[PDB]
Amino acid sequence: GTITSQDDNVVVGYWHNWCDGRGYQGGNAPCVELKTVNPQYNVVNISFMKVYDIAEGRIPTFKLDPTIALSEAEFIAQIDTLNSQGRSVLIALGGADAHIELTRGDEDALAAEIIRLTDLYGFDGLDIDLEQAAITAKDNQFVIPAALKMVKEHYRKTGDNFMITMAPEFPYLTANGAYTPYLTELDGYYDFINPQFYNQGGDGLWIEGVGWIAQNNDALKEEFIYYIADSLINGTRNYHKIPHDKLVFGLPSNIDAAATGYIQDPQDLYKAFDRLKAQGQPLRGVMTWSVNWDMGTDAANNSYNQQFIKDYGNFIHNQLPPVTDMTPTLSGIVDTRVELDSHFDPLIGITAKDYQGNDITADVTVSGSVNTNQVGDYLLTYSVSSDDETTNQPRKITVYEILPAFTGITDTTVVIDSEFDPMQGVSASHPTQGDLTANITVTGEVDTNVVGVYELTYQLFYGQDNQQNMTDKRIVTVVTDAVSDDDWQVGSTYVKDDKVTHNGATWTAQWWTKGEEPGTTGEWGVWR
Amino acid sequence: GTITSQDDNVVVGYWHNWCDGRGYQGGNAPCVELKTVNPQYNVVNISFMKVYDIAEGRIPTFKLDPTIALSEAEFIAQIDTLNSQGRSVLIALGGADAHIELTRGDEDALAAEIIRLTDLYGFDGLDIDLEQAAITAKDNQFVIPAALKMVKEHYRKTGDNFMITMAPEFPYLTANGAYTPYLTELDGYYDFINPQFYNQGGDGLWIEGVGWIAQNNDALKEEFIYYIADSLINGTRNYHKIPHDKLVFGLPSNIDAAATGYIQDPQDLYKAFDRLKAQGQPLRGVMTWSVNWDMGTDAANNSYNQQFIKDYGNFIHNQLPPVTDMTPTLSGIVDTRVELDSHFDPLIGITAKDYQGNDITADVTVSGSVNTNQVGDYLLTYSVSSDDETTNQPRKITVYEILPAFTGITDTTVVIDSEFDPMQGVSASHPTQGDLTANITVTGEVDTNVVGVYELTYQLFYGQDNQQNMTDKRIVTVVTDAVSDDDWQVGSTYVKDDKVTHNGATWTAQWWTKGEEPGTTGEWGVWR
Numbered sequence A, B: 001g002t003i004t005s006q007d008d009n010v011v012v013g014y015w016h017n018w019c020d021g022r023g024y025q026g027g028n029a030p031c032v033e034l035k036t037v038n039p040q041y042n043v044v045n046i047s048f049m050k051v052y053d054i055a056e057g058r059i060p061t062f063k064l065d066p067t068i069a070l071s072e073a074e075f076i077a078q079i080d081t082l083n084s085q086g087r088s089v090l091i092a093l094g095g096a097d098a099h100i101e102l103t104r105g106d107e108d109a110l111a112a113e114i115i116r117l118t119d120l121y122g123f124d125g126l127d128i129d130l131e132q133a134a135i136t137a138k139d140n141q142f143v144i145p146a147a148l149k150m151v152k153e154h155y156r157k158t159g160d161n162f163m164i165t166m167a168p169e170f171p172y173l174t175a176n177g178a179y180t181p182y183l184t185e186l187d188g189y190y191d192f193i194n195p196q197f198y199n200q201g202g203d204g205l206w207i208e209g210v211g212w213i214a215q216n217n218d219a220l221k222e223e224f225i226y227y228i229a230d231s232l233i234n235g236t237r238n239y240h241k242i243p244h245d246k247l248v249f250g251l252p253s254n255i256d257a258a259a260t261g262y263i264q265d266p267q268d269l270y271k272a273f274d275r276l277k278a279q280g281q282p283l284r285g286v287m288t289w290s291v292n293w294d295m296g297t298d299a300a301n302n303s304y305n306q307q308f309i310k311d312y313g314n315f316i317h318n319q320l321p322p323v324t325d326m327t328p329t330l331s332g333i334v335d336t337r338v339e340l341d342s343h344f345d346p347l348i349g350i351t352a353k354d355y356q357g358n359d360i361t362a363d364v365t366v367s368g369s370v371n372t373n374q375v376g377d378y379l380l381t382y383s384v385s386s387d388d389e390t391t392n393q394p395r396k397i398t399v400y401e402i403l404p405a406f407t408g409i410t411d412t413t414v415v416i417d418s419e420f421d422p423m424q425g426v427s428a429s430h431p432t433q434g435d436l437t438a439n440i441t442v443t444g445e446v447d448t449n450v451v452g453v454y455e456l457t458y459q460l461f462y463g464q465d466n467q468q469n470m471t472d473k474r475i476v477t478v479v480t481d482a483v484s485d486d487d488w489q490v491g492s493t494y495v496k497d498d499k500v501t502h503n504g505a506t507w508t509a510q511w512w513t514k515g516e517e518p519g520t521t522g523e524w525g526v527w528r
């Protein structure tokens, strides 16, 4: 009747709010009554809360499929029995091809409906099972955690722990991955995460000395489970940290439950978990899609007969109780580049929380320092302690510099006796320092009274005391406006007294000529 | 004729070894002669070297599609012209649905065929364009870099820079991602990487203060380009580092060239590149799938008319030459956990290379130290310098401990006067210390001559000087073997002189009775 939360190891099982689902291998998942769920599933997730009718608006809800042949009242009664047996029933938000698209300001209405349904049906919490576009559509990444923090606190004020769990597909758990916001904002509020280590085909990770470990590789399943979990529980190898006491391994029940990810030999899981326990970081449990699948039939109409809970139930429940990782969280620490001579403040952007979600940002301290007057790497150490633990994390701050740029320094032709200003159209700038046009000197001059080619060297001085320097060159050609005889052409015919220009001189033909180059005809030739 | 490599900014364009490709929007990509490729494509990649016929074995090759109507000799002639124009022609290995599956030991034959084709056709290098399963199938991740290092060195010994490039889909570039091995092994050998920032739909990254930036989001394309590139060129946000001078932005030419990723407003790219240039890290160029697409038609038979090179050619070529990032690389530095009192060696696993691929692992130094006799976090700093740069990277080493475990401490029933050894079947162990069975004491005793319940407390002492302690309890019940009268039952009928056992006593009926509990019938009732 009241909020029944789990503090030991869990075996989580999703329950279909529909009948006769088709399997990836042509099997069939019947709907089942909640009360027929194997007792060793101590968390059962009602699938799914979603938007049923966009006529009702943007806020998802839950409507029982009547063809399961449970009345509203009976379904409440069966939740009530599971609760009386010390088992939890969660409402799972989302699902494959569920379309949730909330906008900022929707969070109060989402919190209110979660509370309505929880109090009506007797749910013990909520599983965030957003998939595909729903993870990142409109403002889901802000609205959902915001509503859920209001729900957690509403029930905390009556002494209840409304459970919050999540089922992210595992590749979304990398460090800046799509599920980041949900984990960081609900750090301290969530009870455990049960990612899906299924339906991701060849995705996985690279491990030195082993190679690439794919989620679809049966020959290395033990490796897959160990290494991805090890990465998760320590926040290594490009994964967000989920403490081991809050990490629940999500799996398909059988080959019909999912395209890939099914564990053919359960020994690979026993062995992985064991190795994790041997390094002092045992996991919190397992999760499966789904109890209907575990109670279904394959394509030959053979019953799966509870094979999943047969393989894992006892193995998970016979573990020691979990030991809470109470280490605090640090957030916002990223390697950063800082321009030479900028102001850098080591605390901007950085926050912290204790293992229960409380802001402890002012408790953070920093060791080491950055000199933004000198280029290079500076390494800092952040620390914060709470509940007799400390978390430390390092940060690399690189001080760099930026070249300024010249503009307007392009070769040009001007007419004899015009005015020429070497700085007209020339300028320089720098991102920080801004305008550096006054920092340009010019070596050389142009004499526009005298035809020819004039070279100018432009020197830009910048930075501290103008001791850095950039150089560019430019050619200014002074031409006459006076026109003159036509250029000689090899293909033309000339006659006596025709004049031509060629190789800077004016030549006069002495007689008929074609093809004779002025200057090449000697003392007594056709060109004079 | 000879190896023509590029040292300025590049605009890379792939060339189809086939005719009339179908577009994602029903357009058509004709085959084209190499010589008709727009000159501003200064790198043209022949697509694709692959396994054409598994009868020929596992080693990929290149066979010209004859229906392009170029003879072998003419195609060589057209490569020769591009080369005479100072433009590079690469052979692209792989392609969408190309099946390459090499095994270890294949690398000499792969190196020999790359050299054959290069010398035959006049190619100037190779682009690694493995996709899907080819990235990680059999030992591709070892064979391919191994063959290519042999190819680079073969040509280095005749004064040629055989170019090596890669086209990984961008999500494979995260820190332990599938393309890791190719980048790390060819660090120093590759000329630039041109990832594909297309065909990944909603993939992208999370940026504080902006939100989720998807590769398919047109409204934030500028953000997508800036932030993913910024992440790449600095190795932040869970991406491998690719120096900015070696990063070339890969794009679709138009909407028919790819499912998603096309830049509708080129201004978003100009602006992104500009911002990157403003922080002193301008990119090396752009890449496109493909020149045939840029020269194709859409579904309405309208010519695309070179729209891609129109939008980017001048913009990329008018940038300043690249400035080589000569900082060295560090590899293997990962946060690690170490058991209390183990030996930790800070250098095991760690390697380093200079900006040209040379091993400089012995030049690495480490600052700070780890005390494995005390639990906690220890922060180290690795550094190595080469070519007047230094790279620094930090590492967190956590010293942890592990509980031992008891076994055999389970409640038990033994028969009066049997032998009882409190340690039979009891033991303890620890991962490190091993057997701790000799470290168990027992408080309390069992007297098997006297019926009843005996409690035993088992204490395990361990760790340094046995000053840590674990406790477990056990109940040993000593029962008689002597049988006695049957237990009274509420539902049975008894008669005078029937005897029953109940609440530890033997009672005798005085007369007919059913339902009368022995001990409840007073002084003169039926039970005596």
Ligand SMILES: CC(=O)N[C@@H]1[C@@H](O)[C@H](O[C@@H]2O[C@H](CO)[C@@H](O)[C@H](O)[C@H]2NC(C)=O)[C@@H](CO)O[C@H]1O
Binding pocket: A014, A021, A022, A023, A024, A029, A094, A095, A096, A097, A098, A129, A131, A167, A196, A199, A256, A257, A258, A259, A289
């Ligand atoms: C936690 C979890 O596994 N969630 C997802 C499930 O939704 C999904 O199952 C599929 O859900 C649909 C509704 O969301 C159903 O229409 C569909 O029948 C069902 N498919 C099966 C085989 O039961 C599973 C699929 O493996 O994975 C997640 O994506």
Ligand SMILES: CC(=O)N[C@@H]1[C@@H](O)[C@H](O[C@@H]2O[C@H](CO)[C@@H](O)[C@H](O)[C@H]2NC(C)=O)[C@@H](CO)O[C@H]1O
Binding pocket: B014, B021, B022, B023, B024, B029, B094, B095, B096, B097, B098, B129, B131, B167, B196, B199, B256, B257, B258, B259, B289
């Ligand atoms: C660098 C690159 O973009 N490589 C891939 C390409 O192969 C791929 O194009 C497709 O390649 C096939 C052969 O590998 C062709 O059969 C197919 O026609 C072709 N498709 C198109 C539309 O040209 C592109 C697709 O965008 O991306 C990579 O996956």
Ligand code: NA
Binding pocket: A001, A002, A003, A004, A083, A089, A122, A123, A124
């Ligand atoms: Na409840």
Ligand code: NA
Binding pocket: B001, B002, B003, B004, B083, B089, B122, B123, B124
């Ligand atoms: Na060549």
